[PDB]
Design a protein around this ligand. Structure first.
Ligand code: CHL
Ligand code: CHL
Ligand code: CHL
Ligand code: CHL
Ligand code: CLA
Ligand code: CLA
Ligand code: CLA
Ligand code: CLA
Ligand SMILES: CC1=C[C@H](O)CC(C)(C)[C@H]1/C=C/C(C)=C/C=C/C(C)=C/C=C/C=C(C)/C=C/C=C(C)/C=C/C1=C(C)C[C@H](O)CC1(C)C
Ligand SMILES: CC1=C[C@H](O)CC(C)(C)[C@H]1/C=C/C(C)=C/C=C/C(C)=C/C=C/C=C(C)/C=C/C=C(C)/C=C/C1=C(C)C[C@H](O)CC1(C)C
Lengths: 218, 223, 54, 34, 219, 218
């Protein structure tokens, strides 16, 4: 298998130390060898870092798609109040509460501390269930459970599921790096990201990033 | 012990193993009676002297109430306990939900189950909260969801579990794994079902008697 | 004016698209057909160098 | 007319996508062969 | 209940997290399982993390009460000037030096770089003493020499001494989690924390935190 | 067992002198040893006081929840006339009878002596059944039957069943103390208890309890 083994696609091509680090040689998806700081020399530390990285990845995908979708929909044909994920949170305070999708006949949400309380309760439930195992599946694998919340059932074969592991991790690392890009653009330009894309495609040589290079001057 | 006719002639095919069994057959609609089978007549008009059916021909096809797999008519006969228990339980559960829902809707909103459609096709106001839907989309969503539910409930092959399914999803609290406790719960559920079906029939007769609300009739009753 | 009409002649718009509602349908058909094809990829011939030619 | 126009684009792009993903779907091996 | 051992009071209640870090098994005060990052697999590293946690806890204890108390006293029965600890470093530059308790009859220390020099010399000496011992009792435990530090001496009985360790560490965790809160309140609203508590008791349902949310909006 | 046994938690905990009145060492739920007057040194008298306390508890829970409910429903979405148990008894003589649930379409009851007679007959029957046990439940246990009026029946595991006994007794003592609080508040302020709690949340420092301290002067 090309993706993991003694001959995987390492993180610098021919320049990846001519050797892996001695504490990881394949056997897990997404292994390229980039641990140059050496923070995961102990195997339980390394297992905790996988168990943290995969959850950050699976949150970063949804955090990316939820920060793309309203800038598409409101600029195309709908109304939101504000679609940019700066002011997506400030829609409760605005005029009559948060109209989901811009429709004062569905949710029409007010009472922000009540929404906070519902979030705290339900996320405590699911983040306890992910650790111990509760309803709709007994806790058997902390990262790859594979039970009745996976209805289509693609993880039956070992090899195709072993490839889909690497697909999930590659999309995860990309989603994390993109969300870091969203956050730094949000700090610097103060505009929406798809708005930044439409501003960059008009004049790529002068609206690049270097126009915003003297903002943080002492 | 507690029959509808207390110590009289009991029907032969009713004993008491079923929970709400009180020996109730003046009509005998659940009878194990057989069916005289008559063959097909000589419908071959190539030759002369065609004939007719056959009188007392077959051994009359001893009736069975075993549930098959065919999605159209699974039980293969209607007159039997292995259909009538399920029909009584399903009619009773729908009647319980409907008889509770009419009273709660009349108490909260003030509109009858009769006149609820006239006030809900113009505005989808669940207790006056203005849902965005319209009647066509309601019919589409209702038909597809209740149809998926019914096609998924017919798929069970156990004649016990087609009305008493058990497992994990529907018995959330697992209070029916006992023998006598679950028998008492079934013989309570069947009595509450028999009450609710008769009272929704009473709702229908009050609706026939020139309008009601199950409390609008009481507002008529007010003096 | 007197009446109502799209006025789409002589505009010069990509794919004749006027509404973005009209624009989404292209991707909404193309992606689902691509997804059905990409599922159907299971029962086809995938290979290293088993090429169909002279 | 827009209700018609969505439907026309839907039918046209359905048949064109069926065409393209038909010919990508292993065409020159569904012959009598050798 | 049972403070350390097998039956310690692990968090999440019923959600008993039974993939716990198997190298934290009692024997030390405050074992609930915060190695989700797993940063303490090595025993010497874990020992250094206790040796840093307890010092941070005790310094946060000593820093918290001095940031609560003078605003309370200036509200109740004294006057200080800038009671809130923002310009606590600026009250020396206010006139010529700080007057403690609001009284110009004590030290009135000028020469702030000389006071810095005295503080640097004394703290360098005591932190050099704390590592490898010296006078005021030679160190045998780095976490608790305690011999010259106890004129009362309640460290006799071992079970009560372990329970005092547990109470000490829980109070220190609360002190650190409160000082982080005072830092965040200081950054967000720039007021006194007791003034913030007075504002919240005046208006709980509106002036909660979310009115102070659109302040750092970049544009 | 932390709850009852040789080492239960008594009415003074660490200061419980290692001594109750020595004629009782556990064996029943709710035992802390607080018979300071020694009112139950005889064992049959002690049994009668259990048989009386459990009935007072099981009525006290229902009384507490019935006192709590209608002010909450009147606050939420209804009106009841006077939704407070001062004048809930006087709601019969209002205009045309007592309209249950604030609705003059259901019960609309009059004829208080007839309602009293129905109450007397039905309570006589069910209290006599609770004494001896006739049909529809045979008399087998004085306090803990476990029969056809107990559909769930959690008396299978005996230790958890004793834990539920302890929970019932703790809720019973709480319900009795709360109902005595409701009675004393009803004597003093002449207002509903939820309205009193609203007054205290409006003004804790002046409307605490000592505002009504100069009331019963001679
Ligand atoms: C299958 C169960 C079902 C039953 C029993 C009913 C019952 C009824 N619907 Mg109905 N619906 C039902 C399913 C559904 N409805 C509707 C949507 C509507 C609408 C929009 C309306 C009704 C109306 C009615 C009533 C018409 C007849 C009448 O006035 O009789 C009672 C009167 C008599 C028996 C005689 C009285 C004499 C005199 C005229 C007074 C009737 C009570 C109509 C209504 O509300 O009229 C009051 C109406 O406008 N329904 C939907 C779509 C979600 C359904 C889905 O399955
Ligand atoms: C160690 C604790 C300590 C902290 C956190 C501070 C910080 C402060 N000093 Mg102070 N000092 C501290 C101790 C000392 N100071 C001084 C001498 C002075 C002077 C002369 C002045 C100050 C001033 C200030 C204030 C700066 C206003 C500001 O920028 O708000 C922004 C900060 C916040 C809103 C909250 C803090 C956020 C963050 C958590 C800061 C903490 C950073 C690190 C965690 C601490 C570094 C650890 C180690 C290296 C010390 C602020 C209260 C100035 C002042 O009072 O003007 C208003 C001033 O003129 N200090 C001496 C004697 C040398 C100290 C002794 O240890
Ligand atoms: C030799 C001189 C020496 C001095 C001046 C100090 C001084 C200090 N140590 Mg330290 N230590 C010293 C040696 C050692 N220490 C330690 C281990 C520790 C620990 C673990 C801690 C300290 C802490 C402290 C601080 C507060 C403790 C205190 O006095 O109040 C508490 C004690 C009393 C109130 C007893 C009363 C003392 C008595 C009246 C006589 C005092 C005479 C002094 C000349 C007066 C100065 C003391 C006052 C003003 C603070 C302070 C900086 C604490 C700290 O940093 O705070 C966050 C802390 O946690 N030390 C060890 C290893 C066992 C030492 C061995 O040489
Ligand atoms: C360790 C210390 C500890 C202390 C001090 C107490 C305190 C008490 N517990 Mg207790 N408990 C303690 C440990 C524990 N308790 C419990 C669980 C319980 C329960 C279940 C109960 C108690 C009860 C009691 C009380 C028993 C004595 C009594 O009847 O008061 C009598 C003395 C007074 C009431 C003081 C009266 C003076 C007051 C100042 C009057 C106010 C002045 C008015 C203005 C006067 C009015 C004027 C006139 C003219 C009308 C007492 C208040 C009992 C109780 O609370 O009954 C009420 C009780 O049922 N505890 C547990 C868990 C198992 C403990 C574990 O450590
Ligand atoms: C939540 C962050 C996070 C964490 C914990 C991990 C964890 C891991 N990664 Mg990983 N990774 C991430 C994000 C993360 N990844 C992202 C965003 C990318 C895309 C750039 C990658 C790309 C990547 C490759 C290519 C490889 C790994 C590998 C590994 C494993 C060993 C390396 C190690 O010890 O990492 C420890 C990491 C941390 C403790 C995270 C520290 C986070 C702090 C905030 C510092 C980060 C500051 C940052 C560098 C500043 C710039 C940010 C910007 C570049 C986005 C380990 C399981 C190796 C492996 O075998 O895969 C399993 C490997 O070859 N990572
Ligand atoms: C299967 C039985 C059944 C059926 C067909 C209905 C049907 C209806 N109910 Mg209803 N209801 C039911 C059971 C049922 N309910 C039960 C069991 C309860 C008690 C929880 C209620 C409590 C209830 C209230 C409180 C209200 C309705 C209302 C309505 C009407 C419009 C809103 C709606 O459909 O809500 C869909 C669900 C969301 C509709 C005619 C509303 C109305 O305006 O009635 C005219 C209304 O105010 N119902
Ligand atoms: C919650 C507070 C707390 C508690 C329970 C403990 C507990 C303990 N400390 Mg300790 N300590 C603390 C805070 C605390 N520490 C702080 C803030 C510092 C930094 C100065 C130290 C520095 C320290 C040293 C240097 C030593 C100990 C030692 C000990 C142990 C034995 C001494 C003893 O009985 O403590 C007495 C504690 C109490 C009686 C609890 C009450 C404490 C009161 C409330 C403090 C009041 C402060 C006051 C408000 C402000 C200053 C006074 C003025 C009025 C014991 C486990 C010794 C050890 O490890 O070896 C045995 C030792 O040598 N402690
Ligand atoms: C209906 C009232 C009632 C009765 C009959 C009992 C009966 C009993 N309790 Mg009990 N208890 C009650 C209410 C009651 N409790 C309440 C409300 C609380 C919470 C405060 C407790 C808390 C409690 C504890 C903590 C313990 C008991 C115990 C006992 C048992 C032995 C003690 C004894 O001889 O009591 C006989 C009781 C009486 C003769 C009742 C006297 C009532 C007098 C006549 C009037 C009281 C008026 C009052 C003083 C006015 C102010 C009210 C104020 C106290 C709130 C006995 C079975 C012990 C036990 O083993 O539990 C089973 C024990 O340790 N009780
Ligand atoms: C490996 C290694 C190795 C060597 O040795 C060393 C070193 C270098 C250190 C390392 C590296 C590292 C790194 C790179 C890291 C990074 C990370 C990240 C960035 C992540 C993210 C991550 C990210 C993430 C999760 C994100 C998430 C997000 C989210 C949820 C979002 C959400 C949201 C939304 C929807 C929208 C709305 O309106 C709002 C909000 C709320 C906003
Ligand atoms: C143990 C001991 C020991 C030592 O040694 C001595 C001594 C101290 C003496 C002792 C003690 C005792 C005690 C504590 C007692 C208490 C009691 C009580 C409080 C009771 C109540 C009790 C109480 C109770 C039951 C209550 C109940 C209630 C009820 C039913 C109610 C009802 C109602 C309602 C619903 C409402 C409406 O509208 C009306 C009415 C009708 C009104």
């Amino acid at each position: 298998i090309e993706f993991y083994g003694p001959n995987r696609a390492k993180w610098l091509g021919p320049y990846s130390e001519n050797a892996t680090p001695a504490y990881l040689t394949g056997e897990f998806p997404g292994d390229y060898g980039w641990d140059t700081a050496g923070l995961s020399a102990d195997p339980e530390t390394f297992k905790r870092y996988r168990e943290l990285e995969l959850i950050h990845a699976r949150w970063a995908m949804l955090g990316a798609l939820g920060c793309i979708t309203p800038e598409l929909l409101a600029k195309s044909g709908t109304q939101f109040g504000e679609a940019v994920w700066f002011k997506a949170g400030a829609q409760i305070f605005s005029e009559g509460g948060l109209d989901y999708l811009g429709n004062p006949s569905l949710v029409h949400a007010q009472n922000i501390v009540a929404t906070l309380a519902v979030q705290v309760i339900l996320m405590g439930l699911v983040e306890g269930y992910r650790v111990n195992g509760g309803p709709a599946g007994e806790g058997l694998d902390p990262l790859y459970p594979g039970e009745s919340f996976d209805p289509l059932g693609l993880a039956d074969d070992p090899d195709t599921f072993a490839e889909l592991k690497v697909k999930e991790i590659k999309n995860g690392r990309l989603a994390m790096f993109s969300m870091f890009g969203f956050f730094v653009q949000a700090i610097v330009t103060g505009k929406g990201p798809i708005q930044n894309l439409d501003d960059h495609l008009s004049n790529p040589t002068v609206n690049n990033a270097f126009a915003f290079a003297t903002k943080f001057t002492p | 012990d507690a029959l509808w006719l207390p110590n009289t002639t009991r029907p032969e095919w009713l004993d008491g193993s079923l929970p709400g069994d009180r020996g109730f057959d003046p009509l005998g609609l659940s009878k194990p009676s057989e069916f005289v089978v008559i063959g097909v007549d000589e419908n071959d008009q190539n030759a002369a002297k065609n004939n007719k059916g056959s009188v007392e021909a077959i051994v009359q096809a001893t009736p069975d109430e075993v549930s098959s797999e065919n999605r159209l008519a699974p039980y293969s006969e209607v007159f039997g306990l292995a259909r009538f228990r399920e029909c009584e339980l399903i009619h009773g559960r729908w009647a319980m939900l409907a008889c509770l829902g009419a009273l709660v809707a009349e108490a909260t909103t003030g509109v009858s189950w009769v006149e609820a459609g006239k006030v809900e096709l113009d505005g989808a106001s669940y207790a006056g909260l203005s849902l965005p839907f319209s009647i066509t989309q309601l019919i589409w969503i209702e038909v597809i969801l209740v149809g998926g539910a019914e096609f998924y409930r017919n798929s069970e092959t156990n004649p016990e579990k087609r009305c008493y399914p058990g497992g994990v999803f529907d018995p959330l609290k697992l209070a029916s794994e006992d023998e006598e406790r679950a028998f008492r719960l079934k013989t309570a559920e069947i009595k509450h079902a028999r009450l609710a079906m008769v009272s929704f029939f009473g709702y229908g007769v009050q609706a026939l008697s020139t309008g009601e609300g199950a409390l609008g009739s009481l507002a008529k009753f007010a003096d | 004016l007197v009446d109502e009409r799209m006025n789409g002649d002589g505009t010069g718009r990509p794919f004749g698209v006027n509404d973005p509602v009209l624009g989404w349908v292209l991707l909404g058909v193309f992606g689902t057909m691509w997804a059905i094809w990409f599922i159907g990829q299971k029962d086809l011939g995938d290979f290293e160098d088993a090429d169909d030619g002279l | 007319m827009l209700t018609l126009k969505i439907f026309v684009y839907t039918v046209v792009t359905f048949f064109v996508c069926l065409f393209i993903f038909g010919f990508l779907s292993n065409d020159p091996a569904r012959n009598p062969g050798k």
